Every structure is written in structure tokens, then in C-alpha cells.
Design an enzyme around this catalytic site. Structure first.
Site, PDB file in Angstrom:
ATOM      1  N   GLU A  62      -3.630   2.014   4.293  1.00  0.00           N
ATOM      2  CA  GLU A  62      -2.443   1.213   3.970  1.00  0.00           C
ATOM      3  C   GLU A  62      -1.326   1.465   5.000  1.00  0.00           C
ATOM      4  OE1 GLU A  62       0.507   2.144   0.938  1.00  0.00           O
ATOM      5  OE2 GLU A  62       0.286   0.171   0.024  1.00  0.00           O
ATOM      6  N   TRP A  84      -3.968  -4.296  -2.622  1.00  0.00           N
ATOM      7  CA  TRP A  84      -2.982  -5.370  -2.550  1.00  0.00           C
ATOM      8  C   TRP A  84      -3.663  -6.740  -2.730  1.00  0.00           C
ATOM      9  CZ3 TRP A  84       2.303  -5.605  -1.549  1.00  0.00           C
ATOM     10  CH2 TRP A  84       2.940  -4.431  -1.166  1.00  0.00           C
ATOM     11  N   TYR A 110       6.423  -4.717   3.271  1.00  0.00           N
ATOM     12  CA  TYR A 110       6.786  -3.600   4.119  1.00  0.00           C
ATOM     13  C   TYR A 110       6.458  -3.788   5.597  1.00  0.00           C
ATOM     14  CZ  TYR A 110       6.990  -0.939  -0.178  1.00  0.00           C
ATOM     15  OH  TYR A 110       7.396  -0.533  -1.369  1.00  0.00           O
ATOM     16  N   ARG A 190      12.692   3.419  -5.816  1.00  0.00           N
ATOM     17  CA  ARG A 190      13.489   2.892  -6.930  1.00  0.00           C
ATOM     18  C   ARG A 190      12.736   2.985  -8.276  1.00  0.00           C
ATOM     19  NH1 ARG A 190      11.352  -1.707  -8.993  1.00  0.00           N
ATOM     20  NH2 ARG A 190       9.767  -2.625  -7.612  1.00  0.00           N
ATOM     21  N   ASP A 193       5.772   5.106 -11.161  1.00  0.00           N
ATOM     22  CA  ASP A 193       4.760   5.422 -12.170  1.00  0.00           C
ATOM     23  C   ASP A 193       4.217   6.814 -11.856  1.00  0.00           C
ATOM     24  OD1 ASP A 193       2.193   5.465 -13.650  1.00  0.00           O
ATOM     25  OD2 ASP A 193       1.609   3.456 -12.803  1.00  0.00           O
TER      26      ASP A 193
END
Ligand SMILES: O=c1[nH]c(=O)n([C@H]2C[C@H](O)[C@@H](COP(=O)(O)O)O2)cc1F
Ligand SMILES: O=c1[nH]c(=O)n([C@H]2C[C@H](O)[C@@H](COP(=O)(O)O)O2)cc1F
Lengths: 285, 287
Positions: A62, A84, A110, A190, A193
């Protein structure tokens, strides 16, 4: 000195002890705390959590995909990493109202923000050379020329582009800091999990710090993880209690296998995790 | 129950003990820690520091100026607050290679980025209505309709606009959070002059949270202050050591004097700090 992992584990315990019930965008329920911070040493160790296996190949793949500036899920998918794939499917795009979008097209997430912040997004196949601010190359240049700078920031949160993205970024910005030949990084996340996301996320940014340290001739220092809404899904509270019984084993080491001069020239086989011995794998929805 | 001012005082002590010497662009020298975080309750108290007088008129006036979206140092100056004046002066503007620009014109700093993010900055006099994102109104709307949202963010860090700015924002972003009818706020501050800037910066964002809580009918919760490069300038050491020996007095309360409907509606005299009686002012030289 205590194991670095105890930092993450003590965050879990804190949210179990003190988190409050808060509903979520899906409707499963969370225990939640707002505002947390942990510091992970990158000195001669790599904080890949040991109390449950982290998907290392996904982390590395990633990150290489971000670094390339790709916003095409299919390019990540072809590397065996499917994380994704859902967000770029026909249904997913249609249900955001992106019906004229080709499948795979995540919009300006990103990789675009890092390499081309502020450019106009067209599609995932467009030529963006020389457009927008290459924040990632900017950070690397400043580290080499002006290590004392207090403005070494890469930002992925772009309010104009937010409606265009398949998913609003969780990693809003990071900052780098150099003292005494040591590179540190602080991530502002922000929303975390704690069971399924955060261990992965810690690995990504620690890895991004190892990469920039390697190319700028610095030693890895600290990774500081700062959380906004730090949360545990109700349906992970049981799995997590299983996890909290497990003794962290010593973190592995990360080896970079050749000398690499430019951030783009890194490849997956450039990297070897050494001595990763995590506890029994634990599944989570 | 420990006084919330001990959070700030604790940080000063931590940097004095564990900070490492690090030079800065200003040539002054600092002791520095990277990554710190403190939490200030806003529940029935406002964290305006008591171990030295803080410039409250400045805090309040500067925030109303941001809210109005102004980039004109002269509009703040006229209210009696001079803290942006140097940055919007002929000599300084010149030294950043902005020979062309008018005195007062700070470029696209906080006020513009809060109400017009992504719009094309012209000068300090242009009408920006309907250009860029009004992140401030967007935060308020989200709070009213979906308080569970994990995306209530206001960002002032705009890579595209940094070249035109008088200087790059220290307060890179804040995030809001709601649970149990309580509104909390987290500031990411990339760079904190612990002596001179931070006590003021804490009161600015505590104040912004009280304001937004008021218009959304919520109660203020916590202010979480996160720092990047938390530093003490070497010539602040002696004055901070004097400050460290003073005993914190109880934080004041902040009162809002009428019901207010829109954030743009607040005026200075809508607010009263009550019970603020600090230890004397402590001068600390600007870098
Ligand atoms: O890298 C990530 N890590 C992570 O933990 N999340 C979690 C946080 C939250 O549980 C959900 C995204 O939802 P929301 O936008 O409402 O915060 O995914 C998402 C990512 F992209
Ligand atoms: O609100 C602020 N608070 C603050 O602490 N500074 C300090 C941090 C640093 O000491 C300097 C800005 O310098 P630099 O941009 O090198 O970090 O001002 C500046 C502000 F605007």
C-alpha cells in the site's frame, strides 16, 4: 524499558475502562475516547505488533502505491492486496454518485495528495507531472537541507477534494522532525479502529519513517501516533480481551537490503522483516 | 481533583528535564521535545492560565477577526491588538519578497483558510463570498445534524497557499467531537513556543469551542492540545523558572451574555471572563 507494544495494549485497556458508547456511520456501536497519543521507538526495532499478526505485505505494498501517486485500486490489487478494491467497485462508486467513473478510480485520495496536492483531479489515468505540490519530495528535500525546520508536514486532508474521494482520509497529516541525526514522525489520525485499523496504520508510518531516514542518511528515531476518535467496535471487545492476555514478544527488525537514493526507487524486495514471531492469528469483522 | 494548569506546568518541567538542544530558524536556540499532548477540561471553567497574566483581550479579538475571515492586520490593530502588526509591515513584507503588497496584507492566513479554503487569494480587500470551502460553517452544520461524525475537521494548512503567507500556520488543524451532549476539540499545533505562544493558543481554541458549543446547544467538554515541536527558547528558561514557583489560582469562568444564532454574530462584548485574577505578567522576549 517496557515493550513498545504495551503502549497500544494500554490504549485498548483505557478505552475498555473509560470509553463511552457512541453510535457510528454504519450502526454497530463503539466504545470511544477522543484524544490519545503513544510513542514508538524506531531505534534498532520495528513496531509490527506481535499480540496478533499484522498484514505486513499489505502495509508495504500500500505504501509503495501511495508513493507512486496512484489513485487506482486495480494497481494495488494486481499486487495481491485487495484492501481498497471495494471502494472502487461499480456499486460503491454509484452509491457515492460517481456513476461516470471507471471502476478502480478512488478519486484524489492519499497518493494524489502526497504527490500533487492542490492540482485539479481529472481521473485515475491522467497525467499529473509537474502539477500540484509534491509534498513528499518537499519533506525529503527539507530534511536534507534544513533539518531544524518545524514545518516538515505532509497533509492528505484537502477540504476542496473531500467530496471527490471514495473515502475521507483517516490519516489527516503527518510531521517529521530531526534532531541529533535522528528522524521522527508524528501522525495525526482523525479516527482509529483500535482492533482492525490501528496496528496496520502504526506499521505504515513507521515504515514511511524508515524509508525517508534511509534516503536522507538519518537514523530512525520515534514514531508518535496521535488519535482523534479512538474506538473499539462492540463486536471486537471479546476478541480484544483474548488479545490482552498475550505477552508481547520482542519486536522484529526491519532491514533495507540495498542502498537506495530516491524515494520512488524503493521496491517490495528491498525490505526484509527479520524475526517476526506474532502470537496466534485472530480474525475480526 | 488536580488543577488543569498543572498540565501546562508539567510540560514545561518535562521539556526542561528531557528536552534536547536544537537550533531554530531564529538563531535563538531551544530545548525541544517532539510529540506531546495535554487535556484541559472546559466543564464549568475556562483554562486561562493563572501563573502569569494572559492577554485575554488579544485572544478574543484575534478569534473574532479570524471568524470574520479578515487577512488585514489593520482590522485587528484598530481593536487595540497589535500581535499581527509586525508581520503586515513594509519592512517584513519586503524581506519575504512581497515588494508589491500593501501594509496589513498578511496573505491567505487563518481567516481566509477557515472561510474560503482552496479559493484564489487576490488581496486583503477582495470579496471572497461563495469562493472556497467555508470549513467553519461546515463544522457547525455537521455538529447540528450528525454529531457522531468522525470527520469534523477544520484545516488551515494549505500547501498550495504557503508561498503567499506572511508565515506558515502554527495551528495546522483542529478536530471536533461530540458525545453525551458535550463538545470537545483537538488542536494539532505543529510548533509551540511554550513560554510565549502556548498559554494564548490554549485560550484561543478553548474559546472557539465555547463559541461553537453555544451556537449548537452543546456543553463544552475537553480541549486536547497536541504538539509537534514543543520548545522552550533558551532565554525563556529563567522567566519560566520564576513562573514554576507560583501557585495556580482557580481558573476563571467564561460567560456568554446573550443567546447567539450564527457564529458571525458574536461581538466582543458578548463575553465576560469572570473571576480572573492572575499572578503578574511575565515578560518573555520574542524570537
Ligand atoms: O487507515 C485506516 N484505519 C482505520 O482505523 N480506519 C477506521 C476508522 C473508522 O473505524 C473507519 C472509517 O470511518 P469514519 O470515516 O466514520 O471514521 O475506519 C480507517 C482507515 F482508513
Ligand atoms: O500561535 C503560535 N504559537 C506559537 O507557539 N508560535 C511560535 C512557534 C515557533 O516558536 C514560532 C513560529 O516559528 P516556526 O514557523 O519556525 O515554527 O512561533 C507561533 C504562533 F503563531
Amino acid at each position: 524499558p517496557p515493550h513498545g507494544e504495551l503502549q497500544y495494549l494500554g490504549q485498548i485497556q483505557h478505552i475498555l475502562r473509560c470509553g463511552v458508547r457512541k453510535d457510528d456511520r454504519t450502526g454497530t456501536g463503539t466504545l470511544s475516547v477522543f484524544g490519545m497519543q503513544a510513542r514508538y521507538s524506531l531505534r534498532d526495532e520495528f513496531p509490527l505488533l506481535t499480540t496478533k499478526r499484522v498484514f505486513w505485505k499489505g502495509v508495504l505494498e500500500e505504501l509503495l502505491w501511495f508513493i507512486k501517486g496512484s489513485t487506482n485500486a486495480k494497481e494495488l490489487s494486481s499486487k495481491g492486496v485487495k484492501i481498497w478494491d471495494a471502494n472502487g467497485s461499480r456499486d460503491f462508486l454509484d452509491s457515492l454518485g460517481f456513476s461516470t467513473r471507471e471502476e478502480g478510480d478512488l478519486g484524489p485520495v492519499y497518493g494524489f495528495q502526497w504527490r500533487h496536492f492542490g492540482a485539479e483531479y481529472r481521473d485515475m489515468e491522467s497525467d499529473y507531472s509537474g502539477q500540484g505540490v509534491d509534498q513528499l519530495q518537499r519533506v525529503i528535500d527539507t530534511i536534507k537541507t534544513n533539518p531544524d525546520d518545524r514545518r516538515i508536514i505532509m497533509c492528505a486532508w484537502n477540504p476542496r477534494d473531500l467530496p471527490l474521494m471514495a473515502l475521507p482520509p483517516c490519516h489527516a497529516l503527518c510531521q517529521f522532525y530531526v534532531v541529533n541525526s535522528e528522524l521522527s514522525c508524528q501522525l495525526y489520525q482523525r479516527s482509529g479502529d483500535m482492533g482492525l485499523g490501528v496496528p496496520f496504520n502504526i506499521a505504515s508510518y513507521a515504515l514511511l519513517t524508515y524509508m525517508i531516514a534511509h534516503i536522507t542518511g538519518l537514523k530512525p528515531g520515534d514514531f508518535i501516533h496521535t488519535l482523534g476518535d479512538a474506538h473499539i467496535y462492540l463486536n471486537h471487545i471479546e476478541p480484544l480481551k483474548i488479545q490482552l492476555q498475550r505477552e508481547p514478544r520482542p519486536f522484529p527488525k526491519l532491514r533495507i537490503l540495498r542502498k537506495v537514493e530516491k524515494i520512488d526507487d524503493f521496491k517490495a524486495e528491498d525490505f526484509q522483516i527479520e524475526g517476526y514471531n506474532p502470537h496466534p492469528t485472530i480474525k475480526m469483522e
